[PDB]
Design a protein around this ligand. Sequence first.
Ligand SMILES: [Cu+2]
Ligand SMILES: [Cu+2]
Lengths: 655, 655
Amino acid sequence: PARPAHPLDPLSTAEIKAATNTVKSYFAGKKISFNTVTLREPARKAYIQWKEQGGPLPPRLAYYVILEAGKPGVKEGLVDLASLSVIETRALETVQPILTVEDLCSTEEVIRNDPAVIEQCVLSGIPANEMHKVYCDPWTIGYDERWGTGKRLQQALVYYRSDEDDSQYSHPLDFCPIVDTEEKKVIFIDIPNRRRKVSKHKHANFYPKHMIEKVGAMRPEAPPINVTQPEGVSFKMTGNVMEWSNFKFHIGFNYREGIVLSDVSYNDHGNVRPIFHRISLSEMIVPYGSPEFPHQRKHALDIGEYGAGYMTNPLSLGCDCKGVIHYLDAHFSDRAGDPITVKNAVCIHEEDDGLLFKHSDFRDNFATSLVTRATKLVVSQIFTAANYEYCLYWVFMQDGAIRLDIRLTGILNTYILGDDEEAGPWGTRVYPNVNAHNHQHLFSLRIDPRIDGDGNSAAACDAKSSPYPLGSPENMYGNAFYSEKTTFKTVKDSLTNYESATGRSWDIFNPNKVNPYSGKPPSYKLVSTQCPPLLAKEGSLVAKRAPWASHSVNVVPYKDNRLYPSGDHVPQWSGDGVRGMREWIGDGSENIDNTDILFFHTFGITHFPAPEDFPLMPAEPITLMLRPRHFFTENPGLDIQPSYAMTTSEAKRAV
Amino acid sequence: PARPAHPLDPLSTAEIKAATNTVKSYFAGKKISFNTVTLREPARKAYIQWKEQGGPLPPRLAYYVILEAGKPGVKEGLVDLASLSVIETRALETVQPILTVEDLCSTEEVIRNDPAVIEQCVLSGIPANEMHKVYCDPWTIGYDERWGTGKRLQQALVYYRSDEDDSQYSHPLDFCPIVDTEEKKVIFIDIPNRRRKVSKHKHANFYPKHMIEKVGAMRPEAPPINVTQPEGVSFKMTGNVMEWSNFKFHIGFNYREGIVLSDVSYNDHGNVRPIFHRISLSEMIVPYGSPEFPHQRKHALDIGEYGAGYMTNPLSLGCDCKGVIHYLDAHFSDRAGDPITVKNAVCIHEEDDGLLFKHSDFRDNFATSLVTRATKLVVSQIFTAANYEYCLYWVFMQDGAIRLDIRLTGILNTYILGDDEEAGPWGTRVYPNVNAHNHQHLFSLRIDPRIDGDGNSAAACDAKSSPYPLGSPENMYGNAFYSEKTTFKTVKDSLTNYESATGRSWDIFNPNKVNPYSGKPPSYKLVSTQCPPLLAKEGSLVAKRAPWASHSVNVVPYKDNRLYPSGDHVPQWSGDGVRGMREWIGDGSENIDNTDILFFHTFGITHFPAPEDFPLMPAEPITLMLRPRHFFTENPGLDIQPSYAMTTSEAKRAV
Ligand SMILES: [Cu+2]
Ligand SMILES: [Cu+2]
């Protein structure tokens, strides 16, 4: 296939087809299906050498995962696209791979046609001839110690719709079919000891036609707020390379992480300074907090088990993203090895962001005044994991800060509640016979930094009172305080949590350089306070399958292909074994001071549902920021034209 | 004077004049000056009776504070505006009041003409005939144990400008004149043991003309983003009463708190439900962290000592607030008893706020989809306390949540640093010879709640793992977790801090009512994580003068006139004595469960300056939110017209 404009560009549709033809030929005569066909990114060293040192062009490689009929687990490998050849391959008989949209599409018809499932619907109050009204959200089984990875399994969380336009989540059923993904058959049904028949209440609906019935009428359309950019946008795109307000970076995308931002630099008045080699979300875990069987199996690692790319929404013009928008499409492979496209998967636009800075002089009643307005650049996607919606916004700012904003919406996962059953303390009755279980949403932000170049370190920064007491010569009035910086020397040192007691932040810094004013190394500081402890206990299934989630920060040495901290193939892993973050941490002794490092940050929220969240939940925001501190020698935005500026002398001339 | 449209309306210019004429007549023959002339708000009970019970119209009252030449401290009292009479009066000989813009603009000429100050400038390298180049930020002395409240005092933080258009903060001088505010005389000068002469470096400037010299050129003007509302706005104002997206409230304003939001309710499909009686910022403290003399005196309580009203910027017009704006003016009294106006003190507008909610069905590739966009209502002011700018945004949202957003900007307070002097650990060298000291910015949000009516309580809510161990029948897989609610019974119980370990939130709730779905009381939940510990030690000046700041939450019984938690007259109070929050806490034993309560929340940031913050600092954000939880029985925004909606049936019809 033709070479891309840029080594980090995602595989084109032609490259995906070329890769799958190559793989089909290599396994000729075998019955195989495609699970993953994606860019294998060039080695970090090879990329930097190519980009900055006139070095070798890295080979264009595709990583694939396939299944073979009648063979356990998966096969994976690499295709060299230039030579149309498989160059690496291996069979992994004891793992299970990510569930694609197709993998999961099939489950509902399997359960609708299964005699044991039909029997359970009838027992639950749904007649056998109304199976078309039965739906399920096909989840990964997550992990079930009865089958391990020996079969590829889904669990069907079952619901009922009185009409196809209903939101089904007011009507969960009590039982849980277990489905063999590849054999397309129900192999078991978890049946509760206490049966609860289908709710007889009206569905809790949310479309305008439903709302008219429920509350009498919709609100009139509000007078509009119109955003226009009649002279175009300030950002410039060259293929997938973005240039805006001195930032330059590559916007990549894949089946798993969704948006991947690479080769991020800031043009500091002609001096182009690296900041990050790569930043993305690398895994998630959404652990539920009901201990009752089988609810322990609700702890989706959405990124590893379904994929933020696979799950991503086509973004419908003028609606999800308001204003003048640049869109990118996403390309994957289906099971047959044919390219599939999701149109308008990523939206790119710039937005007003209030004030950047202002100062006025009281001396002439603020006549002396300067105000400069802020614009932000937003690179966004929205993905749907069954009930949930995750709106993801990568935000670049004119003071050089970078922010990740997330908004959680969609629908609560619900289970049935008996008439006289108490949902607490593990959940909330959000509607009659509806129990919305407690759960956390946790994310693993993966940062491969290059703060002002190569050779970086990380530290925890804690605000502390002076150790000297009130009334001492050193602290006479007891007001002294400082920032205690703990530089991480080894992996073990880095395993740290957010602490409200010290308003903890973390620095990622270049110990080889010095700010000529402050004397401190250039850094980007992680400012992040939505950092829940992992509530699941040590040794729990949740804690074992997501070793990264137990600490707010994990810093490990860089190696190639250290992307996914719960391992490469997540579904049905028990959490036993040295893989992912557990492998990378090892015995905790490896050096992480002044070297190539990877910084994985766990953040998110703890959700205790309330009726406000039902039947459709208003957006709940999550955010973290990476701020330049001691990176610049002064406010980098001062060369932006103010919205208003008047000097003292000018103010005098006009009185 | 004519009666206002509404008992909570600020005093008009006519009422202010009427009040000062009354006071001058009462004190005829005496030489008095006006410090404060402001609405005395009606009693909570009287207001609610008037508003909701056809009760008596509360009298229209003005509170005043005056000084009298040759008398110590102040006099204060009340004027009944209908009868033009002083109805209450007292002398407070041992306090000092808020510093007005006039009180402060006087100081620079005092120091410029003082022989001892001139001598110090000369010693500092500034010739006697260049005193016009010497400037000072006149601060409250804060507290100095050498004078107590026996004289009304300011401390002059002295700077040098080479040219009138310079930003002076690159050039602090080493000494600190102490000025008697009322005698207009320097009484003392704090001189350091180690002298540091004025910096010989160029000023660190930030206007376009300066930037052209420094960096070569400004960036070209960006292509514009234009915001228009061609059919007008969705909000309606009747005088100061706002109506928007079912919210209704009164927008008040005063000299001290700035914006005061009152009588806040939500129209729940015809059922008008109270939320808050009053919400505002009630005090601040900005304690610096250098222990060296005289820097202990840098701990401004900006609200109590200068006033968020007095300090407020006239905004400015189509620049500070972008879009279609409704403005309010502010009115105060000057020293002579004449009304003064700040034009465009408050801006009111509505803004795009991204998505309100979304959900799509994977079954038909997200063809089944509903997306509804969010609009926010913003009521904002910006005030300047010498170097600092505080941008305050009260934000109402369509899910029924209320947010306070703050953006910090303006200029770092700076002190001189010697060539070879190390600024750390108490400050940062942000520019040659410039030391920007560490400091916190803390705010006291005052909430007078009325959650779904009268009789309220508050609680801490902590996320907790089940106490049952992994592998127990109760918690087999170790995943169970819940929210532990600790209802505050007495004042002492409420004295609580934010805790990262439990993701602590606080509920304000009505224990007299029950959500028909969840079974929980209706509540607004305080979600707030920017909650620094007070770093200054117990028994410190800072801790004593700001008793409220040592806990994230303080809940006390309602009584009338319990507004200001550091006392009514803040400057030069030593922090000794039972007044403000210390009085309201008492012995901690008073009931706060199911009664009229006041909830004071301490939030803010800890600032360790970096060169990025200089010479003018990019906005740093602070936020908290109050979210309805168990208040509604479902998402209250579902009757808002979606931006896009397609059902499953519609999707099938569209092929
Ligand atoms: Cu949730
Ligand atoms: Cu600050």
